[PDB]
Paper text:
A density corresponding to a bound phospholipid, most likely PC, was observed in the same position as in the WT; deep within a longitudinal cleft that extends from the exoplasmic leaflet to the canonical phospholipid binding site where TM4 is unwound. In the E2P state of the WT, PS forms only a few hydrogen bonds with the binding site, including an interaction between Asn352 in the unwound region of TM4 and the terminal carboxyl group of PS. In addition, since the terminal methyl group of PC’s quaternary amine cannot form a hydrogen bond with Asn352 of [name] mutant, PC binding is likely much weaker than PS in the WT, as seen by its weak density.
Most mammalian P4-ATPases, except ATP9A and ATP9B, require an accessory subunit, [name], for their proper localization and functional expression in the plasma membrane.
Author numbering:
A (entry chain C): 27 to 350
B (entry chain A): 19 to 29, 38 to 415, 651 to 726, 743 to 1091
Write the structure that this text describes.
């Protein structure tokens, strides 16, 4: 027939691979030979990383920061002494961790006006209905509407190094550059027009829990409102009940000295964020990084355990096929 | 009785001459199509879900569970409406035929559809009668005509019919006009051999002659006229009352064994869904029992949500979990199934192995709903006259291939017992060393002798056997004694005793069978000890009832007529084309769809299990793990094309090597690939992979940073890693099952992975002003700046595909 083409007659050219057991046995050896060395490389890298986490949520009678678990005068001030046995070599990063904090809760995640945080003129005055309980108060719309922005983490952590004398030398913490380039440079934008940020938020009001409006978060025009690094970092949800958020980074000194020399340090914290209502902890984490990121032995242990199981299975399936 | 006037003038309550081989008219198309579409449990479930989401107030618009349902329903309805429209056109070429009618002293030509009861029709030599005529006159003397009813009862001899003695000398289409008579005939009956009637010819002066009629005058519709230049008959029965059309048993809905396996799978996956939704709700309401677990001061409920009823909140939460996990029951699977059924049915029509030169046409596909059960046939019921017969080109070596494939061939004919047995010997169905167990009317000329030998040749002669040794011969009159008289003896029922012998002999021959008894045999076979898939292949109008009765009915485009090629599912213009139709086409058709339906459930279980495991680490708050842009696009964009192209043009065994070897047919016989064994393997593999994705991503997120610049990830980035691993694993899983790698498979398998990666680049990377969520602006583009995430994804892909590789190494050798 005139329609006796290859497609219509089911005779299209094909590859037809033969996946026999004699051509897959080398695959089990190749995979095991290239997974084990990778697993070792990710395993010593995870061990060379230095990381210290100190807990400061109080809840202990002999805890230095317990004295203001329910303080009478605010703001609270409390200091914690820790020591570094081994100096931190590269550029270290300051994190803060919160457990039992369900940021990945359906009623919490959807509680933002992403169009309003994008600098939209219309969404600024009349925010969305999803951020309902934290949407309007005093007849005025809340500028960072929603639970995510309303419950922003607002502790102040500072680090001091106890020198040869009693007086401490404060180490400099860098604020800018902790959030994603993309979600700070495009996704999070200020309202479009105006001379100063105090004028762009005319009809809006600050969140109830905040002490200062969004336009007074920082004295830096590039870090003032809706583009604040800390606000942007907090407004990215957590994916787990216990999480960590980047707080500051300590750039490596131009000298040969390590960024965090071994010694006794002070972590003196302005205890502003309460977490003991929902039985949540609160810690500060300093850590060095690598090509893979932070300290996690899961990848190193899994790659070795996978490349050694496949290798042994290949040996077994090779000795077995020696009978025939 | 009815009154018929010969010239259609006095000397209404009857229908019009028309053939209806189609199912739906314009009035009952929707009500009848809805019943067939809602026989599917997924459609019923998603109709119930849509109905509940409208009557009550929900946080879930009904549009999420109503648009897919409406799309599926009108996708599988356009196909049925178009397929039945071709059957409407098939009846047009026979209804709007050409017939000549002696209206008034003139040979006006009407259509075969415009014949009324009581008009003198004229039929020439070799012409089939348009309706049930009564022979009034023949041009020659003696008023005798010869009729061959080879399509009505399978007899090859010429039968002689007699005209009416009063009107034998009326010819030339002129004296017919001057004929006044009234026919008082019996209301139509399907016996095909008896007829009672009367003619009351009235002359100008006086004629009270009442010549009693009989079957020797009636000319049936569908029987050709031979060795007579022309005749002059008067229509009495005019379609849907013709004796040929009264033996049609009535159309029903045919559904293959794969469509019934989908309903059984949907029952298991409905229990998984209701278990997930119940386990999540029960654990949610014990988690929320802690005062600080709900309203923890950082997300607080509104007043409306606080004052709502707790008992209504339980129901709403259960239904919300059901909506969250509803993808476990795929409705996009029906759109793929019907599309691949419609596009795969063209391989039968396009085949050049089904082309007959002497009649100049190939195979026909009336219905594409039963492509997959051509590879599941267990019994073959073949006519003889016209179908098996000299013999046909390969009528004997086609039966050998059917026997090697494990099929059972029964011959159901309406011809003489001796002729039929000689034909069965000729086609090597009854070999020389085959002892015949004749149950015909020759030895059963009584009612009680039937018991004396039905039990004699089964208990004492058949249990005392080889399988091939014996062969049964049954008659149509004796089968009536077996069936009708079995309503009294229930201790030793004649039907069961007869059926025991039928299943123990190599071949069964049924002779002198009425068209409604060949359907009764298929009905008896269809009901015994399970679900034997039955096939019936015929060429005449007496095979139509058994074609509409079997699971799949094949028709032969023979010289007798096209009555069995219009009421069938497929029509090959030869008996030998059944070998390639079943062995080569049915095998691939079943193998493709059985793999597709298993893969569709595996695909969705791997998609939903990580989202169910997320609830234990969320606040049990039915928060989706993946983005709304991923949840909807997973089934229609990322994983829709690779399985469509596989199940359309994938050959696990080359099309030229399973036609040569017929013993590969029994490998898949008995719904082998849709059984509990394979179902459990696919479900357990899907559960293992779904657990691996989530718990390999969860242990990776204990780092506080996955990249070198020390930046943290959110919940959406947690969801995109799981989704990437899931998509790559379920796509590379099908690449391992592919044995026919065409350039189209290379384009839809590697083009689906290359499109998902770029869609991440594009969806994340362009700001749309009209959107109001903007929650995935650069999630993947910041995900790809970390080496440790790439290494984890590749590791989780190989771990999940490790059982498949192990089974390929173990089972697929020796
Ligand atoms: C879509 C755009 C982004 C959405 C924005 C985000 C918000 C959306 C929110 C609301 C819901 C939207 C739903 C609308 C759509 C539902 C339609 C529906 O139902 O028919 C869908 C389309 O049929 C199909 O299988 C597709 C047709 C058959 C297969 C052929 C594939 C055709 C497309 C291929 C393009 C791929 C090309 C590129 C890759 C390959 C390389 C070349 C199937 O249903 P489903 O499985 O998707 O539904 C399940 C969800 N259940 C249960 C709630 C209803
Ligand atoms: C003042 C006192 O009682 N104990 C302090 C202790 O809290 C610290 C330590 C630092 O080395 O110096 C001593
Ligand atoms: C749990 C918690 O911190 N609640 C406080 C609330 O008592 C106070 O009235 C409000 C105003 O700053 O800030 C918040
Ligand atoms: C920002 C500040 O200085 N103090 C705030 C306080 O006003 C608020 O009530 C509390 C609730 O989280 O968080 C802290
Ligand atoms: C560190 O915190 C303490 C807490 O009272 C407070 O005196 C001040 O903010 C800091 N002190 C020094 C010495 O850095
Ligand atoms: Mg026939």
């Amino acid at each position: 027939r005139p329609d006796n083409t290859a497609f219509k007659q089911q005779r299209l050219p094909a590859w037809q691979p033969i996946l026999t057991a004699g051509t897959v046995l080398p695959i089990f050896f190749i995979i095991g030979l290239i997974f084990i060395p990778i697993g070792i490389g990710i395993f010593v890298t995870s061990n060379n990383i230095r990381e210290i986490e100190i807990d400061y949520t109080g809840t202990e009678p002999s805890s230095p920061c317990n004295k203001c678990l329910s303080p009478d005068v605010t703001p609270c001030f409390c200091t914690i002494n820790f020591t570094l046995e081994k100096s931190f070599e590269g550029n270290v990063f300051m994190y803060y961790g919160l457990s039992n904090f369900y940021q990945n809760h359906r009623r919490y995640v959807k509680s933002r006006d992403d169009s309003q945080l994008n600098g939209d003129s219309s969404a600024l005055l009349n925010p969305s209905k999803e951020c309902e309980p934290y949407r309007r108060n005093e007849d005025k719309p809340i500028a960072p509407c929603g639970a995510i922005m309303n419950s922003m983490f607002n502790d102040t952590l500072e680090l001091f190094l106890i020198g040869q004398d009693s007086y401490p030398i404060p180490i400099a913490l860098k604020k800018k550059g902790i959030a994603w380039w993309t979600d700070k440079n495009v996704k999070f934008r200020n309202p479009p027009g105006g001379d100063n940020l105090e004028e762009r938020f005319k009809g809006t009001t600050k969140p109830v829990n905040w002490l200062k409006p969004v336009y007074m978060l920082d004295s830096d025009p590039d870090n003032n409102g809706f583009i604040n690094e800390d606000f942007i970092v907090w407004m990215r949800t957590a994916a787990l009940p216990t999480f960590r958020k980047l707080y500051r980074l300590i750039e490596r000194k131009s000298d040969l000295h390590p960024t965090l020399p071994a010694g006794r340090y002070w972590l003196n914290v302005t205890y502003n964020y309460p977490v003991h209502y929902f039985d949540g902890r609160k810690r500060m984490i300093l850590s060095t990084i690598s090509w893979m990121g932070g300290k996690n032995p899961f990848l190193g242990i899994a790659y070795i355990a996978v490349g050694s199981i496949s290798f042994l299975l290949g040996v077994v399936l090779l000795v077995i096929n020696h009978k025939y | 009785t009815r009154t018929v006037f010969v010239g259609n003038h006095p000397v209404q309550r009857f229908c019009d001459n028309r053939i209806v081989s189609s199912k739906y008219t314009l009035w009952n198309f929707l009500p009848k199509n809805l019943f067939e579409q809602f026989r599917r449990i997924a459609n019923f479930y998603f109709l119930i879900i849509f109905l509940v989401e409208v009557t009550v107030d929900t946080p879930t618009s009904p549009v999420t569970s109503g648009l897919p349902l409406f799309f599926v329903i009108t996708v599988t309805a356009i196909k049925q409406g178009y397929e039945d429209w071709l059957r409407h056109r098939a009846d047009n070429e026979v209804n709007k035929s050409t017939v000549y009618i002696i209206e008034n002293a003139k040979r006006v030509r009407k259509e075969s559809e415009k014949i009324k009861v009581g008009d003198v029709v004229e039929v020439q030599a070799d012409e089939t009668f348009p309706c049930d005529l009564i022979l009034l006159s023949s041009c020659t003397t003696d008023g005798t005509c010869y009729v061959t009813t080879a399509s009505l009862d399978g007899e090859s001899n010429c039968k002689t019919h007699y005209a009416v003695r009063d009107t034998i000398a009326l010819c030339t289409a002129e004296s017919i006009d001057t004929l006044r008579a009234a026919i008082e005939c019996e209301q139509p009956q399907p016996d095909l051999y008896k007829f009672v009637g009367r003619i009351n010819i009235y002359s100008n002066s006086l004629e009270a002659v009442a010549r009693s009629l009989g079957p020797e005058n009636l000319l049936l519709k569908g029987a050709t006229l031979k060795n007579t230049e022309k005749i002059y008959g008067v229509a009495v029965y005019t379609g849907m009352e013709t004796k040929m059309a009264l033996n049609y048993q009535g159309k029903s809905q045919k559904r293959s064994a794969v469509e019934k396996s989908i309903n059984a799978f949907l029952i298991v996956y409905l229990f998984i869904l209701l278990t997930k939704a119940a386990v999540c709700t029960t654990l949610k309401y014990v988690w929320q029992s802690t005062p600080y677990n709900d309203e923890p001061w950082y997300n607080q409920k509104t007043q409306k949500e606080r004052e709502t009823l707790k008992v209504l909140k339980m129901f709403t939460d259960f239904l919300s979990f059901m909506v969250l996990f509803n993808f476990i029951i795929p409705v996009s699977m029906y759109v793929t199934v019907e599309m691949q059924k419609f596009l795969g049915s063209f391989f039968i029509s396009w085949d050049k192995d089904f082309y007959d030169e002497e009649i100049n046409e190939g195979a026909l596909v009336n219905t594409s709903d039963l492509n997959e059960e051509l590879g599941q046939v267990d019994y073959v019921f073949t006519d003889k006259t016209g179908t098996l017969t000299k013999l046909q080109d390969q009528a004997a070596e086609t039966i050998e291939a059917l026997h090697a494939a494990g099929l059972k061939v029964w011959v159901l004919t309406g011809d003489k017992m001796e002729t039929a047995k000689s034909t069965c010997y000729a086609c090597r169905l009854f070999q020389t060393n085959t002892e015949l167990l004749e149950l015909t009317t020759k030895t059963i000329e009584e009612s009680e002798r039937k018991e004396d030998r039905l039990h004699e040749l089964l208990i004492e002669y058949r249990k005392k056997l080889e399988h091939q040794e014996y062969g049964l011969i049954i008659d149509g009159s004796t089968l009536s004694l077996i069936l009708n008289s079995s309503q009294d003896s229930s201790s030793n029922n004649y039907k069961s005793i007869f059926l025991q012998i039928c299943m123990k002999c190599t071949a069964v021959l049924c002779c002198r069978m009425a068209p409604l008894q060949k359907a009764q045999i298929v009905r008896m076979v269809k009901n015994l000890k399970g679900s034997p898939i039955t096939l019936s292949i015929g060429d005449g109008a007496n095979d139509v009832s058994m074609i509409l009765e079997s699971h799949v009915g094949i028709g032969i485009k023979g010289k007798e007529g096209r009555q069995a090629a219009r009421n069938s599912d497929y029509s090959v213009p030869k008996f030998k084309h059944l070998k390639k139709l079943l062995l080569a086409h049915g095998h691939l058709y079943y193998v493709r769809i059985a793999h597709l339906v298993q893969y569709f459930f595996y695909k969705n279980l791997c998609f939903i299990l990580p989202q169910f495991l997320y609830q234990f680490f969320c606040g049990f708050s039915q928060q989706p793990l993946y983005d709304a842009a991923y949840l909807t696009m997973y089934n229609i964009c990322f994983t829709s094309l690779p399985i469509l192209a596989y199940s359309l043009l994938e050959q696990h065994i080359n099309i030229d090597t399973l036609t040569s070897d017929p013993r590969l047919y029994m490998k898949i016989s008995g719904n082998a690939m849709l059984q509990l064994g394979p179902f459990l393997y696919w479900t357990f593999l899907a559960a293992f992979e779904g657990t691996v994705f989530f718990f390999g991503t969860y242990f990776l997120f204990q780092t506080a940073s996955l990249e070198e610049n020390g930046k943290v990830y959110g919940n959406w980035t947690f969801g995109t890693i799981v989704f990437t691993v899931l998509v790559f694993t379920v796509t590379l899983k099908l690449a391992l099952d592919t044995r026919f790698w065409t350039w189209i498979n290379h384009f839809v398998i590697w083009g689906s992975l290359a499109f998902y990666v770029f869609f991440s680049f594009f969806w994340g990377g362009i700001i749309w002003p009209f959107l109001k969520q903007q929650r995935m602006y650069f999630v993947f583009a910041q995900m790809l700046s970390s080496v440790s995430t790439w290494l984890a994804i590749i590791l989780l892909i190989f771990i999940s595909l490790f059982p498949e590789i192990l089974l390929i190494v173990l089972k697929n050798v020796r």
